[model samples]
Target: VNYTDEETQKRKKEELDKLMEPALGYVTKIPVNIPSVRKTEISEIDTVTDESLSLVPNEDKLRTIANENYGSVVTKSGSNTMNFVRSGYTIDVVHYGLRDKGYVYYKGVHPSKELPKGNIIVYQGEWDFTSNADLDAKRPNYNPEFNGAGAGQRVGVTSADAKERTYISKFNIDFSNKKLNGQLLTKTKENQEKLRYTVEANISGNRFRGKATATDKTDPILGKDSEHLEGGLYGPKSEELAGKFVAHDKSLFAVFSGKRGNDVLETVKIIDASKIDLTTFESSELNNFGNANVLIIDGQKIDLAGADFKNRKTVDINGKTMVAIACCSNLEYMKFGQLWQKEGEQTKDNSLFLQGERTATDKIPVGGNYKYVGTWDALVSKGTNWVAEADNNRESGYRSEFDVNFGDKKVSGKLFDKGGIVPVFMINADIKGNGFTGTANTTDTGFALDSQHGNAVFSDIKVNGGFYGPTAGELGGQFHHKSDNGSVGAVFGAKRQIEK
Candidate 1:
């Protein structure tokens, strides 16, 4: 080796730089992109009274006027479109995009001609149990593998006593402060405690821990001593939660899971059609009726036959006393549909639509290497035949896994076959703040079709998703693929692997 040679020194420096690349490329500043409404022209306007028209322009009037002109108002990003409607005096804005639909009332007129500037940055809602709580009231049962008795086995309580255990009824979280509070409702089939226990916990990143306190200090189970609780958040945005708990004396132990309440719509008012006139109007004024299920009134199309109106019950639209029906099928979201005749109108006509938006507050990771393990669900269709599969059903669907390098700002993953041994689709994406977008490709062993069909490789694979948890503790998103076998659309959720 030539010591101190210029060429040798240059080569050494290059090797050192390569070794430090990840550290040097670590993200120091996390970028944030808040959703904001775009300014558009109000093509026309109608008022109940002349004085009402001059009573200072409000959000309802402005949104109604804009919708009446533009039909469906698209956002500045062009990722979402909004539809507005007036009922009596209030206005409702529905957001439609790639994700779930969201509903919000226009707060006020923006100086920049924007409808609404701030999206919901934090979540404040209730989380109810998703499944039956696992209760180990007294102790474990006898087991041949564990000597004479199993772990936690005791004679203090009977198996029947476990059946009368307590369960978490409601869990509430405020992401703004990472604080949680909930209630534990008791089962009295065997005549248990009448009082409920209050639960309080604090969240750190994706994990949470807290204590349960009984209403009566002298009560049994969680009363005499404090009960410790621990759990983690799930979903792409902390939409679900689960955890386990135990009493200090080991008198009680249990596990619970829950899902956050839907906050997509503030209110859904369903009016009786019989109380209002349902006369169908025919005129040239009613235009854009391209679909039999939709009726365009004031530019906005109100879904008639296709609208799902069974679940929602509330109203926010404002203007002259008009009868409107709520639409959309997803129980988590609702929108306006089918607008009938305005009060005291000779001819009857109708219209409706909906949507929503949100803001992220979790902190993004700057530098680290992590792995994610999760499941994928998809609807695989071939011609007229379709089959729904999920990771849980090892017979079909996909097995998803990913490796994320925050320092490199990159993600690599794969969707495997039922056995999770054979490679199906390989994924590569670049990380940007808390979100990532990438492409997937089929391997030699990868194919959506059966093995007998040979390699029916898929193409045009697109995958997009975002990081969740306080420190990017989870990854979730959606992916789509097109192939000769069929077209596939799938969703996946995964948690960061904890290194020991």
Candidate 2:
């Protein structure tokens, strides 16, 4: 008639997960995990706005995820400040920790206090600020980064000093468009009091194709607005600028500097600011592609055909500029691209990308044959060089040859050691990829009674490893025996016995 503690918690989690489905409706891609532990209890806080809601899990719930996971937590004071912690980070509104009126507290080398702008700096030095288009201008150029650095990368989030906003003026003042055939959008300051003139224009890659209205507009300080020397009328409802219409949520810097528009000669800014929209700037990095990416890793040069550098951004790593790009297509394992270059140059000479790790069970070469080279070791032999790197390098003299065939879900191979083609005993008959299952038995050879003078098993050989680039020109993998001083294994360039 009663539920156990585990059962009660299970029901609670189910209800919380159900609530998450609707809360995340705005986003098409929901996170894999939704924490059940709400940071602010229902009885503690009133209305939970999307901006104020914190999905960070409790300590107990955190143990369910990685030990070093983080989440955001909001306070009742309506003060949301970014904070950092070991293993995970939190965006906490320290309404409870404020000392003087509106004074937030932080415990770093920098004094915890309010700014000239009168605002709190929560857990600073935590986020990789320099890593994105956002910077902590509020601080002395701190390297704090975040998910939404304006320009919509943060999913409907906005900031005052985002790098996206820094490039707003460049995009706004740009008036060059080789394709435009009529008057272009004009730039002007309304008056001295207002200071900066409001600028409006559309930008495509390196090109700014301005829009013109039929209504006569004029600024007292800058006089009558001049029409573009080229480009047609840019009506509000006309679809003329559809192709170059830049979205509010994308990076305009990419548009201003990309190879789409005329040469960037000069841009002028009156003493003020204007909200601008890049009309001709291409949107969506996912849609843009070119062969601009050249990836070099481990002395291997990988030429990416369908490459997208539109979403790519750069940061200073050790005083040298390093660019990161979102990579996709062709390579099944590429997660992202990282390009490295000199301090002042934009040209990248090298790049590194992560590849999906292959497990033994993943690449088995079940229907093909592959030749393998590796070393063996025995625990009683007092061998202490049983390292995986040795298996990778294969520099040691202890090498073994394996020409294995896998078919009908079974593996067979002829293993030869320094003593010639020794008998490979199948103690455990199992097909382990392109590898074999057996042991290397040492038999005494002399002027004896028979062809065999008995045998001695030096070690338990279990040649269960991997074969990469199978069904190709070459194949290879590492294998070893199981013992105290386990025999280290190594292989290089697995030459396939049969033509793939």
Clashes of each: 21, 33
Give RMSD to native, each candidate. Answer: 29.6, 25.7
Roughly what TM-score does model 1 have, to 2 decimal places? 0.32
What lDDT is reached at residue 216 by model 2? 30
For every model shown, what is its TM-score relative to the native structure?
Answer: 0.32, 0.26
Q: Top model by TM-score, which number?
A: 1
| Candidate 2 lDDT | 0.24
Worst lDDT run of 10 residues, candidate 2, spans 22-31
| Tens-digit per-residue lDDT, 1-500, candidate 2 | 43334546567545333322111001111011112221111111011112112332132332323223333232111114222111111222121111110111111111111111112111111110001111211212231222222322111111222322121111212232213222222222332121111224433221123432222333211122212211111111111121111111111101111111223222211001011111111111111111123332221223443444123555454444555443333222222333446546555543222222122233455465455443332111122221111122234333334555555544343333333343322222355433334443334331111132422243444433333332322222223333342222322222334345
Alpha-carbon runs more than 4 Å astray in model 1: 1-362, 382-388, 392-397, 451-455, 481-485
Candidate 2 segments exceeding 4 Å error: 1-89, 94-380, 383-399, 408-410, 413-429, 432-456, 470-493, 498-500
TM-score of 2: 0.26
What's the lDDT for all of these models?
0.40, 0.24
lDDT of candidate 1 over 48-126, digit per residue (tens): 2111211222444445544645433221110111111111112122322211111111111000101111232232221
